[PDB]
Design an enzyme around this catalytic site. Structure first.
Site, short mmCIF file in Angstrom:
data_model
loop_
_atom_site.label_atom_id
_atom_site.label_comp_id
_atom_site.label_asym_id
_atom_site.label_seq_id
_atom_site.Cartn_x
_atom_site.Cartn_y
_atom_site.Cartn_z
N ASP A 34 0.80 -1.22 0.00
CA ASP A 34 0.00 0.00 0.00
C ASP A 34 0.84 1.28 0.00
OD1 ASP A 34 -2.01 1.95 0.24
OD2 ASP A 34 -2.59 1.35 2.26
N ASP A 223 -1.05 5.48 -5.65
CA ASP A 223 -1.55 4.69 -4.53
C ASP A 223 -1.95 3.26 -4.91
OD1 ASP A 223 -2.65 3.69 -2.22
OD2 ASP A 223 -4.34 5.08 -2.13
N1 LIG Z 1 -3.03 6.99 4.61
C1 LIG Z 1 -4.14 7.21 4.54
C2 LIG Z 1 -5.55 7.51 4.46
C3 LIG Z 1 -5.97 8.76 4.93
C4 LIG Z 1 -7.31 9.10 4.88
C5 LIG Z 1 -8.21 8.19 4.36
N2 LIG Z 1 -7.81 7.02 3.92
C6 LIG Z 1 -6.54 6.62 3.95
N3 LIG Z 1 -6.29 5.35 3.43
C7 LIG Z 1 -5.47 4.45 4.23
C8 LIG Z 1 -6.02 3.01 4.24
C9 LIG Z 1 -6.30 2.54 2.82
C10 LIG Z 1 -7.02 1.21 2.92
C11 LIG Z 1 -6.43 0.08 2.37
C12 LIG Z 1 -7.05 -1.15 2.46
C13 LIG Z 1 -8.27 -1.28 3.11
F1 LIG Z 1 -8.88 -2.48 3.20
C14 LIG Z 1 -8.86 -0.16 3.67
C15 LIG Z 1 -8.24 1.08 3.58
F2 LIG Z 1 -8.86 2.13 4.14
N4 LIG Z 1 -5.13 2.40 1.97
C16 LIG Z 1 -5.21 3.23 0.96
N5 LIG Z 1 -4.24 3.33 -0.01
O1 LIG Z 1 -6.34 3.98 0.94
C17 LIG Z 1 -7.16 3.61 2.04
C18 LIG Z 1 -7.55 4.72 2.99
#
Ligand SMILES: N#Cc1cccnc1N1CC[C@]2(c3ccc(F)cc3F)N=C(N)O[C@@H]2C1
Length: 374
Positions: A34, A223
């Site tokens: 990720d 991403d």
């Molecule tokens: N940093 C941050 C961040 C900041 C604000 C909102 N979201 C973020 N992300 C991090 C977790 C995430 C993810 C991955 C898998 C999964 F099952 C669920 C999931 F929410 N990974 C990504 N790339 O986007 C998703 C949301």
């Protein structure tokens, strides 16, 4: 790098994971790769969608940090306990790292039914780590503790049950057998997310003709943990309008364009040719230069008769170049030189008429003014 080729697997729309071991003796887990986050976090308690989890008490090398962490997302959340342990990647570099690990003890709408992964490997920078930037992310630990060069590269290959996908994560180098043609670099604008700058967007060779600030409002990131190409509202609306026009030969329900409903043709009769290519021009290393990555319908129509979902969606948090964009390409996360490189992947999608492409330079005026001033 031969041992790292094809070390990724996943299900369409559910992310790419790599196998890792945690603890002593090693506990085997599948971990989502990720680039959009910065925590190494693993299920550490029973869950309906987990078939295994990290058991800290079985590890002789676990160290408790006596610190909790709570991580809310827009749609879901998880909370856990911070600690350190020995971590390895069996089909990765021949090294072992003491890494921070968030042991996930409770979660809501986080783990995915059938996704086959049990944790997430946040490969982005400390600036966006939780609880704060003092929690050294995995890759930082790897580089500091071992001789591994400060860069990694991702080749995501993509295309009953959801289709299985594969790819490679090459750590510490660039594998030339995984791409063809030239590698073009765009600067990392800021080390938090992998933030980049888009200066121009074309749909079937037609410029969307927007102020380039619109393309990066309020940011643009690369991403691997997001499936879709997500675009800011204004850009999304202009994009679908153009795509609708190019394909107006047929008509689809609104739900398709909303990325909700699927659309099917008789097996092998998918009319790729009525859908336009999309070119995203990324800022070059040289101030007034850019290069374009051109992606095919084969990438932005995601298979789920041959049934597809429209994999472009509206964003309110900037542009996200997700897995479907990355799938055309070999993507180099050159942290050491603060840049991201793109080249045509050995596993790119292509029909007899068109092909994904990475082409440059193209010369544009004022592209520093394309960003968002923090
Ligand atoms: N940093 C941050 C961040 C900041 C604000 C909102 N979201 C973020 N992300 C991090 C977790 C995430 C993810 C991955 C898998 C999964 F099952 C669920 C999931 F929410 N990974 C990504 N790339 O986007 C998703 C949301």
């Amino acid at each position: 790098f031969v041992e790292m080729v094809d070390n990724l697997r996943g299900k369409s729309g559910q992310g790419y994971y790599v196998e890792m071991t945690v603890g002593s003796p090693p506990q085997t887990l599948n971990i989502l790769v990720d680039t959009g986050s910065s925590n190494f976090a693993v299920g550490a308690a029973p869950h309906p969608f987990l078939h295994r989890y990290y058991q800290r008490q079985l590890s002789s090398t676990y160290r408790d940090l006596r610190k909790g962490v709570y991580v809310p997302y827009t749609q879901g959340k998880w909370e856990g306990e911070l600690g350190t342990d020995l971590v390895s990647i069996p089909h990765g570099p021949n090294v072992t790292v003491r890494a921070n690990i968030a042991a996930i003890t409770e979660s809501d709408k986080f783990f995915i039914n059938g996704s086959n992964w049990e944790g997430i490997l946040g490969l982005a920078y400390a600036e966006i780590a939780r609880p704060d930037d003092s929690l050294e992310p995995f890759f930082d630990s790897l580089v500091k503790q071992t001789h591994v060069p400060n860069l990694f590269s991702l080749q995501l290959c993509g295309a009953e049950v959801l289709a299985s996908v594969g790819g490679s994560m090459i750590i510490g180098g660039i594998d030339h057998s995984l791409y063809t043609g030239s590698l073009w670099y765009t600067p990392i604008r800021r080390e938090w997310y992998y933030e980049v700058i888009i200066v121009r967007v074309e749909i079937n060779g037609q410029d969307l003709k927007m102020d380039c600030k619109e393309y990066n409002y309020d940011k643009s990131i690369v991403d691997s943990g997001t499936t879709n190409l997500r675009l800011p509202k204004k850009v999304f609306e202009a994009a679908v309008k153009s795509i609708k026009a190019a394909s107006s030969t047929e008509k689809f329900p609104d739900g398709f364009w909303l990325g909700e409903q699927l659309v099917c043709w008789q097996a092998g009769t998918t009319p790729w040719n009525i859908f336009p290519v999309i070119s995203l021009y990324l800022m070059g290393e040289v101030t007034n230069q850019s290069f374009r990555i051109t992606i095919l319908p084969q990438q932005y129509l995601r298979p789920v008769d041959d049934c597809y979902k429209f994999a472009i969606s509206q964003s309110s948090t900037g542009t996200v170049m997700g897995a479907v964009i990355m799938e055309g390409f070999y993507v180099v996360f050159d942290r050491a030189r603060k840049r991201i490189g793109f080249a045509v992947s050995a596993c790119h999608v292509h029909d007899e008429f068109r092909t994904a492409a990475v082409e440059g330079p193209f010369v544009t005026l004022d592209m520093e003014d394309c960003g968002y001033n923090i």
